[PDB]
Design a protein around this nucleic acid. Structure first.
Ligand code: MG
Ligand code: ZN
Lengths: 48, 1292, 49, 586
DNA sequence: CCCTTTTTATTCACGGCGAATACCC
DNA sequence: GGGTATTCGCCGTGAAAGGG
RNA sequence: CGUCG
RNA sequence: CGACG
């Protein structure tokens, strides 16, 4: 749940965030890339 | 004497005169950056070596050459005094000149078309000030040195730590400067393996086959070749008399009718002497010795062209029969041994099938890259740029020197690249250690460790930035177009600026400097830390690394290490210790020639110390340079032994060579233990400056070096007289012999008043010179924090008695009277900093305008019409200082936290170019321009008076001179107007801020902290403790005169802790106070001058061969009264750490000042008023005050805020949090019953957000009943395990 | 704090706690050493089905 | 397992010698901050404030109305004092806090031996219980007056450390000649009056009439009047001693262990109620007479033996002669080094013996004509002999030579440190001492973390063992016997079987009868019969040979070494055992 | 909001447990 | 045809950032 | 055990 | 997340 991973909006040049949210965002990005890759009839090495 | 020493002469008790003066303590920080800044024609050190390692560069198929011309540093627009109050980085721009030429077509050395030279700016480097600090973000920053291992080759070993067998195992390790390591380890099965960068194992034949070596070019190097020849009967080998010692008799050794060794006879010296005397060459060997040898070279045939056998095989009977019947005259082999030699190369060649260079390169590419398939060309390029490329593997001169010194080479210069013979010499040195004729080295020796300063780390970071810039321009020039635009914007200054901001900012060795004491600043600047980048880890250290080697004599102080996690690694540098050219350490030594001690000094390194013999500094002389004793103690190679008189080669300089400058200020160091002196040196660094810092009665004499070596005081640059004395500035008119013909004239010294340090401690400089006092060069002008007339004054001194007083000094506590509180002695001013940041906000930005809601009617009287608090108003923690409004009305005003109540002394407003204040920053700018105008008017009024005197003395030659001085006056007024316009453009310029802020206001609060029960006070010998109760005056014990004792200590720590130097310090302080009271007795009444001068001469002539030798006959009548005024509170005593005063001199000084010999006078009780049964040791001791105030330790919380990730209270004092109930407290509660105590500890107080409110309501209504509830942390854990692929629930 | 979400996977994947448990659960359940499981899971070799 | 708590504070410890054993000192600001809802509830129940906000405004404005309300809530409400390093159960105790002026907590000196907290800037935490059951558990179980014994052994933890033992040693001592020697007194009050008036000295052999009470009968206490030759200070200290103790515990030398044996005798004869007042009265008398003693150190207190230089000269001559014999080619170096270190150890022992003989016999006082020799009244000798602060080895290193300083790699240098701390030293006699000090500091800094990890591993092994039964009945057991390493004895029979139920009957070697039954407790009376019968091995039930499922019984454990009775049912003894094992591991 | 290519290569003490080569009957 | 002693590695505790 | 970002 | 006592 998002209450277990608090993201306080800091004030500065860079944004402060948690690493677990970035890992989950990377997992969702890889899953969406694989979902876009399966809809194009890709060969074996790229889906591998 | 100088003008400072004539004010108050400190009496010295040293018996041995010094030969070498104490040098500048900040030389290890100043000379390295000086060599980094300036240019050298050789290009060895500095920025020239960094620019020469990259330039020149050459692109492939482009014919473009970008060479180097010169460079020049720029001048910063801000000085040091402006960046400390502005916030910008004190740095200077770097201007470099390059030249880009282009060649013709099909001509690598053709002519050029055009030249491209310009001035390119690449980043701003931070400049070091005169004290050795760096201003990064307005704070002075000090980068400490790094003690790392020198590049080269070493030999480590393990004492059976890997295998269970009891034996020894050696290993060689090559450490380069920038490259990959090379480990050559042994095995218990007599094998050799190669480990590179902690990768997988690899035998030594692969690294030998890859260097273009055959099989016959390997076995002939590590072994001796034995050549057999065919004879008529009983074919024989050659004999060497030095190769058959240690082997049993295998046959009957007999030649020419005389029997040498029979069957089963051990070789004695007579038999080998007869063999060396006969030296015959015809001796037979039987057939059972042939099969024990191996093959050295593969036998080829000259008739059929077929090989007989391969290389490194076993000799059999059919093979020797075929070799005898074929016609092979030369039979080659090697020699095998068990106590002299070792067949390791023959064993290594039979554990792997690697025979050719191709399989060796395949194994190299497999060990280096386990995923990529092996090949031929890329593996050859990989082996080319591993160890035979200067861009990826380069060593310095110290690495080549340590590599050639460990292999017995006379050349100390090289190219810095590894060759093929270096590995052969390393393996040949490694074999002799295993065989028995070698020796092992050690890592803890100071000859193998190198100190890296900031001048090398900044050069390495600049080289990293330069190689990044040249890699970027090489990747850009591979596809870009040429002769298009001037090479000025193609060089990106952003990677170099990011590299120097990462190096000078967030780094392991770039730490803050604590400005609580000048001795603390000197110790922090002279700090040798073994940790940092490129070193070891604190948590991964062992026993011998934290242990100090005996070769640290005079180079590392043994009683200055921080106790705790890192002890023995953050050690400090000694007094006379100096760096070397290669980066080592050297100490001066007096040269002893045929018994005559010459006054010249010689700096000896760590490896040169053991080669010679050095005597001790505590040796009596006959005033001629000779030793009065025959046998004296010295050191030969690391141990103490008695030597003769002629055998003495060197001698120490002084007794203060071993300890540092932090441990030299402890009087009577030889009477204390090592742990007590270590704790005293650690607590002396944490001294806090009091309100009126007075002089110590018992000192050493190096306090003046600490006072004038650190940039915390004001010294005179040129000699002259003082013209104007003020608390803000000091105007000194220079003399005529030091006045430059082109200078401005007088010198103006600005004094910092009430500035904030890094430890929230108030620091200021107060003047000490009078109106019209002659000063000279090197004379002090203003006493800063912890300074008394150019001497370091850490704490105060008072009456100290050692007796138990009603249990108020039970373990370590200190009973302090109310006279110390009433005399305003231990009161410290603390300055805090409170800022207010106003950033961007949607639907109404953050402003400091009027009509702030949620206020009171009393808040308007303390603020102005804008909202800024006035300077000089006593505030209370919880009030409103800066009222900031945030439209979204919402209030975001800056408030004072509870626990601090001070006075506003300075308000700094930093505005941007968009919004400018109309009443706050403008009056600050007017005050700064008025101060600058007053300063320039006071500096040029003397020049205007001199020009008026010139125009009155002068007023055709005279008309031409009048026109000359008139046009000079016009040029002077023109440059005056130009300087005024330049100062107006400099002051009213502005600054840059972060993208997002509007303005930043800062309010400084000055709180006055006094002494209270709960504070921490200590001395200089390790007598730490706290204060229990402020006793009244009439309750304290007193002597017959009625003077009460200020501090009552505990004498129980004297038999427990071995620090008895505090007793000698107390007796010496009592004698000094008696001398001062006898001096003041001649000043309270009307006395003469000659009797006081005679008493002063008697006080400075105790005897026992002192080295002070003052002369009071040369003093005039005006300075004797000033000296008596400076000595009416007590005479300072200089006591060195090992050349200190004896007990007889203390007894003579006690007998001189009408004091008893034992020093224990009978004291009466304060409460009852009767004499004690035993005499009490009472005297004067120099006490200190530590930075452990009770106002920063007391914290309590009943209800407060909680975290968001879990329902638990916070922790600390700045945030409103509670104490942590650890697991050991839960174990201690489980040792008792404590069921409902543990149920309310971790469920009601922390968790149960609906249960703790019910508990608070029950306490309010008057019910002491709780609920169990449900802990929220267990629900967080249940939701966390359920986020994985593991299911967990609760069953009913 | 108690409401959760789920992410579907278009391609199946293996677990880590049942792979490097020392000993492995999949390595104990099947007649296979760990290196062949790492070869199949990292697409290095095939298995006949 | 570890959470942040509320109603907690932290400050710096202070001695505060005017307090009692069951109370401590709390500041007014901490007592006002940690007791805000109690003050709010008292203001609501008293009917003084209108609402909770009015009470909050009255509290945060610093008024003089809620100050006497604090006297009703910090009267019978104990707090939980705690040190930041916790090793066993005595690190968390309960005290009744009083209102003092300052910003520091006053920790009692009698519990400092259990807390292991000196006053060199140490900090401690204080907790406030909220539940009524938590307050009753802090009063009845976690109180400082209830926990006076050690959890590892049956020894009292409330001992005079350095100052009270020095005051009791200076008050009770024998002299040969003083003011008012040879007079007979009528009681202890006359001796105290003569000491306070100044007509008689503190250390003088006088005769007083004392009445000692005995409890040999059952139900009453008899009395007997006698006149014994004693000291005036012992007659003053007899008023501190209650009626349950005889005069044989007062007339001794009264060192460090004598006060502990006196407190153990008072606990084993009278109980817990007269002991907590007797220890406080001992501490009050010691703190009162420590100011009257006036012991101080100096230069003349650390004497130097005049025959030390002769021993040093003959030792250096012997090393020079054996070095000449080594250089001549007679004795090899491997035995010459052992001979040099042996004669240096012998010279160090001779110098130490001469220094001890000079320290213990240096004062002579005459009585009539000829003079007499007695024990010296030196301050360092009084602090070393009584066991107040410092062992004998530190006095040997201080006055005499400190001996040989060893190298940290394992070897030891053959030449020792000649000069002592009173005389001057060079840099050669200060290097190896710094080597050994840095080695010892790194050793303790690593071994305290090793001991912390060891006790952290040792708590979780026996964390689930609760006594659930009283009697089970087992026929097996261990053979308890004092072990013999080869020389003399090390642990007697009394300190091995004290408070443990035996397994079977003990066979007598002389007459072969039955001494003890099977299920019986071994108190302080059966051990005397066991040592008088001179048995070899006793079959005693242990913890390993029990048969209770999921825990042990009350008979297989025995005495809990905290109380005189048996351990009650439901005590987690495994955590106490792990804490008593892991505590002296440092 | 998205691909790619030239090489950032960075150092404990001690113990438990799993896996590829071997001599002998 | 067939198996555990010895050894050697892995794990437990205190290659991806730059511009438009 | 604290301070800092 | 690093430095310091
Ligand atoms: Mg302490
Ligand atoms: Zn049982």
């Amino acid at each position: 749940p998002p209450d277990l991973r608090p993201l306080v909006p800091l004030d500065g040049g860079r944004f402060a965030t948690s690493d677990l949210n970035d890992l989950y965002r990377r997992v969702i990005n890889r899953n969406n890339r694989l979902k876009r890759l399966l809809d194009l009839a890709a060969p074996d090495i790229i889906v591998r | 004497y100088s003008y400072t020493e004539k004010k108050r002469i400190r009496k010295d008790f040293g018996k041995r005169p010094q030969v070498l003066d104490v040098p500048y303590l900040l030389s290890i920080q100043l000379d390295s950056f000086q060599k980094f800044i300036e240019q050298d024609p050789e290009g060895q050190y500095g920025l020239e070596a960094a620019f020469r390692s990259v330039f020149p560069i050459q692109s492939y198929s482009g014919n473009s050459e970008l060479q180097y011309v010169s460079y020049r540093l720029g001048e910063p627009v801000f000085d040091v005094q402006e960046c400390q109050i502005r916030g910008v980085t004190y740095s200077a721009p770097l201007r470099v000149k390059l030249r880009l030429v282009i060649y013709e077509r099909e001509a690598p050395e053709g002519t050029v078309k055009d030249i491209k030279e310009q001035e390119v700016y690449m980043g701003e480097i931070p400049l070091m000030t005169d004290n050795g600090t760096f201003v990064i973000n307005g704070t002075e920053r000090v980068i400490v040195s790094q003690l790392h291992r020198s590049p080269g080759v070493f030999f480590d070993s393990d004492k059976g730590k890997t295998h269970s067998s009891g034996k020894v195992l050696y290993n060689a390790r090559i450490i380069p400067y920038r490259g990959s390591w090379l480990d050559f380890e042994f095995d218990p099965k007599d094998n050799l393996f190669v480990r590179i960068d902690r990768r997988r194992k690899l035998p030594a034949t692969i690294i030998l086959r890859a260097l273009n070596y055959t099989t016959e070019q390997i076995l002939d190097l590590f072994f001796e070749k034995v050549i057999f020849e065919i004879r008529d009967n009983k074919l024989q080998m050659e004999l060497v008399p030095e190769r058959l010692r240690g082997e049993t008799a295998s046959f009957d050794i007999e030649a020419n009718g005389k029997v040498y060794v029979e069957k089963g006879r051990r070789i004695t010296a007579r038999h080998i002497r007869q063999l060396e005397k006969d030296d015959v060459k015809l001796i037979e060997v039987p057939v059972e010795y042939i099969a024990g040898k191996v093959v050295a070279k593969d036998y080829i045939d000259e008739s059929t062209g077929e090989l007989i056998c391969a290389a490194n095989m076993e000799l059999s009977l059919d093979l020797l029969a075929k070799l005898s019947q074929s016609g092979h005259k030369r039979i080659e082999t090697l020699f095998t041994n068990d106590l002299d030699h070792g067949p390791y190369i023959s064993e290594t060649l039979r554990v792997d099938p690697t025979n050719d260079r191709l399989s060796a390169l395949v194994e190299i590419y497999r060990m280096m890259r386990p995923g990529e398939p092996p090949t031929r060309e890329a593996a050859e390029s990989l082996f080319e740029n591993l160890f035979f490329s200067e861009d990826r593997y380069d060593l310095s001169a110290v690495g080549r020197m340590k590599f050639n010194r460990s292999l017995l080479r006379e050349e100390i210069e090289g190219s810095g690249i590894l060759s093929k013979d270096d590995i052969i010499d390393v393996m040949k040195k490694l074999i002799d250690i295993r065989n028995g004729k070698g020796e092992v080295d050690d890592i803890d020796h100071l000859g193998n460790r190198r100190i890296r300063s900031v001048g090398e780390m900044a050069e390495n970071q600049f080289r990293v930035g330069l190689v990044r810039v040249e890699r970027a321009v090489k990747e850009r020039l591979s596809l870009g177009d040429l002769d298009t635009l001037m090479p000025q914007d193609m060089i990106n200054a952003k990677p170099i600026s990011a590299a120097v901001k990462e190096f000078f900012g967030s780094s392991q060795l770039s730490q803050f400097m604590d400005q609580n004491n000048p001795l603390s600043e000197i110790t922090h600047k002279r700090r040798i830390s073994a940790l940092g980048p490129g070193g070891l880890t604190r948590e991964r250290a062992g026993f011998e690394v934290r242990d100090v080697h005996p070769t640290h004599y005079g180079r590392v102080c043994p009683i200055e290490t921080p106790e705790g996690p890192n002890i023995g690694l953050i050690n400090s540098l000694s007094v006379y210790a100096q760096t070397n050219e290669y980066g080592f350490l050297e100490t001066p030594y007096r040269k002893v020639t045929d018994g005559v001690v010459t006054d010249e000094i010689h700096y000896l390194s760590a490896i040169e110390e053991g080669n010679y013999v050095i005597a001790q500094a505590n040796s009596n002389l006959d005033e001629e340079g000779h030793f009065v004793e025959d046998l004296v103690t010295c050191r030969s190679k690391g141990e103490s032994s008695l030597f003769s008189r002629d055998q003495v080669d060197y001698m120490d300089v002084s007794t203060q060579q071993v300890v540092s400058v932090g441990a030299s200020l402890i009087p009577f160091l030889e009477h204390d233990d090592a742990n007590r002196a270590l704790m005293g040196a650690n607590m002396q660094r944490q001294a806090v400056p009091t309100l009126r810092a007075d002089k110590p009665l018992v000192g050493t004499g190096m306090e003046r070096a600490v006072a004038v070596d650190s940039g915390v005081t004001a010294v005179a640059k040129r000699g002259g007289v003082v013209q104007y004395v003020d608390a803000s500035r000091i105007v000194i008119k220079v003399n005529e012999d030091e006045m430059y013909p082109g200078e401005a004239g007088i010198d103006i010294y600005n004094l910092t008043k009430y500035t904030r340090s890094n430890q929230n401690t108030c620091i200021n400089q107060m003047p000490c010179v009078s109106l019209g006092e002659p000063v000279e060069r090197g004379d002090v002008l203003a006493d800063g924090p912890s300074t008394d007339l150019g001497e370091l004054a850490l704490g105060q001194n008072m009456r100290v008695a050692f007796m138990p007083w009603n249990g108020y000094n039970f373990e370590d506590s200190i009973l302090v009277s109310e006279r110390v509180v009433q005399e305003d002695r231990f009161t410290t001013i603390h300055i805090q900093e409170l800022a207010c940041v106003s950033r961007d906000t949607k639907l109404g930005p953050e402003e400091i305008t009027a009509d702030i809601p949620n206020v009171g009617e009393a808040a308007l009287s303390k603020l102005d019409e804008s909202g800024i608090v006035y300077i000089g108003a006593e505030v209370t923690g919880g009030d409103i200082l800066v009222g900031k409004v945030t439209p979204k009305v919402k209030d975001s005003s800056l408030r004072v936290p509870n626990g601090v109540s001070g006075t506003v002394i300075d308000v700094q407003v930093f505005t941007r170019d968009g919004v400018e204040k109309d009443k706050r920053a403008l009056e600050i700018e007017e005050m700064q321009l008025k101060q600058a105008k007053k300063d320039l008017s006071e500096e040029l009024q003397i020049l205007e008076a001199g020009l008026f005197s010139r125009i009155r003395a002068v007023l055709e030659e005279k008309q031409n001179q009048l026109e000359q001085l008139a046009e000079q006056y016009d040029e002077l007024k023109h440059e005056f107007e130009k300087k005024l316009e330049a100062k107006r453009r400099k002051i009213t310029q502005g600054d840059d801020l972060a993208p997002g802020v509007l303005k930043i206001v800062k309010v400084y609060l000055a709180v006055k902290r006094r002494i209270q029960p709960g504070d921490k006070m200590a001395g200089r010998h390790g007598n730490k403790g706290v204060i229990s109760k402020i006793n009244p005056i009439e309750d304290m014990p007193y002597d017959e005169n009625g003077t009460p004792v200020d501090i009552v200590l505990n004498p129980l720590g004297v038999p427990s802790r071995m620090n008895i130097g505090q007793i000698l310090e107390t007796h010496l302080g009592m004698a000094a106070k008696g001398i001062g009271d006898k001096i003041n007795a001649m000043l309270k009444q009307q006395q003469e001058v000659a009797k006081l001068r005679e008493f002063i001469q008697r006080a400075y002539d105790l005897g026992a061969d002192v080295r002070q030798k003052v002369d009071l006959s040369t003093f005039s009548d005006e300075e004797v009264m000033r000296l008596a005024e400076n000595l009416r509170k007590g005479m300072p005593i200089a006591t060195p750490v090992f050349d200190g005063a004896k007990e007889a001199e203390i007894k003579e000084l006690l007998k001189l000042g009408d004091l008893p010999t034992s020093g224990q006078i009978r004291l009466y009780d304060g409460r009852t008023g009767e004499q004690f049964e035993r005499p009490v040791t009472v005297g004067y001791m120099y006490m200190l005050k530590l930075n452990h105030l009770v106002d920063d330790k007391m914290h309590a919380r009943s209800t407060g805020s909680y975290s968001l990730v879990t329902q638990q209270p916070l922790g600390g004092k700045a945030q409103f949090g509670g104490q942590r109930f650890g697991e050991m407290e839960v174990w201690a509660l489980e040792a008792y019953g404590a069921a409902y105590t543990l149920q309310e500890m971790l469920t009601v107080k922390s968790d149960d957000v609906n249960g703790r409110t019910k508990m608070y309501k029950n306490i309010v209504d008057g019910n002491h009943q709780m609920e169990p509830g449900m802990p929220e942390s267990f629900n967080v854990l249940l939701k966390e395990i359920r986020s994985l692929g593991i299911n967990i629930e609760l069953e009913d | 704090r108690e409401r959760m979400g789920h992410i579907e996977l278009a391609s199946p994947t293996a677990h880590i706690w049942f792979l490097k448990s020392l000993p492995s659960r999949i390595g104990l359940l099947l007649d296979m050493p760990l290196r062949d499981i790492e070869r199949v899971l990292y697409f290095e070799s095939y298995v006949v089905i | 397992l570890g959470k942040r708590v509320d109603y907690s504070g932290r400050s710096v410890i202070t001695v505060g010698p005017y307090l009692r054993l069951h109370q401590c000192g709390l500041p007014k600001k901490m007592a006002l901050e940690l007791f805000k809802p109690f003050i709010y509830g008292k203001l609501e129940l008293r009917g003084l404030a209108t609402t909770i906000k009015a009470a909050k405004k009255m509290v945060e404005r610093e008024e003089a109305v809620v100050w006497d309300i604090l006297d009703e809530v910090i009267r019978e409400h104990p707090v939980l004092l705690n040190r930041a390093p916790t090793l066993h159960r005595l690190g968390i105790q309960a005290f009744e806090p009083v209102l003092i002026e300052g910003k520091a907590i006053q920790l009692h000196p009698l519990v400092c031996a259990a807390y292991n907290a000196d006053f060199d800037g140490d900090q401690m935490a204080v907790h406030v219980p909220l539940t009524l059951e938590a307050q009753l558990e802090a009063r009845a179980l976690m109180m400082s007056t209830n926990n006076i014994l050690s959890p590892a052994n049956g020894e009292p933890i409330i001992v005079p450390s350095q100052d009270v033992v020095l005051g009791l040693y200076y008050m009770t001592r024998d002299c040969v000649n003083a003011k008012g020697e040879g007079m007979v007194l009528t009681g202890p009050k006359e001796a105290e009056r003569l000491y306070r008036s100044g007509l008689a000295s503190l250390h003088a052999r006088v005769k007083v009439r004392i009445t000692e009470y005995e409890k040999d009968a059952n139900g009453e206490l008899v009395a007997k009047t006698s006149l014994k030759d004693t000291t005036v200070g012992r007659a003053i200290l007899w008023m501190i001693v209650p009626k349950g103790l005889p005069y044989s515990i007062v007339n001794q030398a009264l060192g460090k262990k004598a006060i502990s044996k006196m407190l153990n005798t008072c606990y084993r004869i009278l109980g817990l109620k007269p002991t907590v007042i007797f220890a406080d009265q001992i501490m009050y008398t010691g703190f009162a007479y420590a100011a009257r003693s006036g012991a101080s150190v100096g230069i003349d207190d650390m004497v130097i033996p005049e025959k030390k230089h002769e021993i040093i000269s003959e030792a250096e001559a012997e090393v020079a002669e054996i070095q000449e014999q080594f250089q001549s080619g007679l004795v090899t170096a491997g035995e010459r080094y052992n001979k040099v270190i042996d004669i240096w150890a012998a010279a160090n022992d001779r110098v130490s013996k001469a220094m001890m003989d000079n320290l213990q016999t240096e004062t002579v006082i005459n009585r009539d004509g000829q003079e007499e020799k007695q024990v010296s009244f030196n301050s360092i000798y009084m602090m070393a002999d009584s066991g107040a602060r410092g062992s004998a080895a530190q006095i040997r290193q201080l006055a005499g030579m400190r001996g040989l300083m060893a190298k940290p790699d394992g070897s030891i240098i053959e030449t020792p440190i000649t000069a002592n701390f009173r005389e001057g030293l060079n840099v050669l006699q200060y290097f190896i001492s710094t080597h050994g000090a840095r080695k010892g500091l790194a050793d303790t800094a690593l071994k305290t973390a090793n001991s912390g990890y060891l006790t952290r591993r040792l708590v979780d092994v026996a964390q689930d063992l609760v006594v659930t039964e009283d009697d089970c009945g087992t026929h097996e057991g261990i053979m308890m016997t004092p072990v013999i390493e080869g020389g003399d004895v090390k642990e007697p029979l009394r300190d091995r079987v004290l408070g443990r139920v035996t397994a079977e009957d003990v066979l007598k070697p002389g007459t072969a009868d039955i001494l003890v039954p099977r299920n019986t407790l071994l108190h302080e009376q059966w051990c005397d019969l066991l040592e008088e019968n001179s048995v070899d091995a006793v079959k005693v039930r242990s913890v390993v040979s029990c048969d209770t499922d999921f825990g042990v019984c009350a008979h297989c454990y025995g005495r809990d070494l905290a109380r005189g009775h048996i351990i009650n049912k439901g005590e987690a003894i495994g955590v106490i055992a792990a804490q008593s094992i892991g505590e002296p591991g440092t």
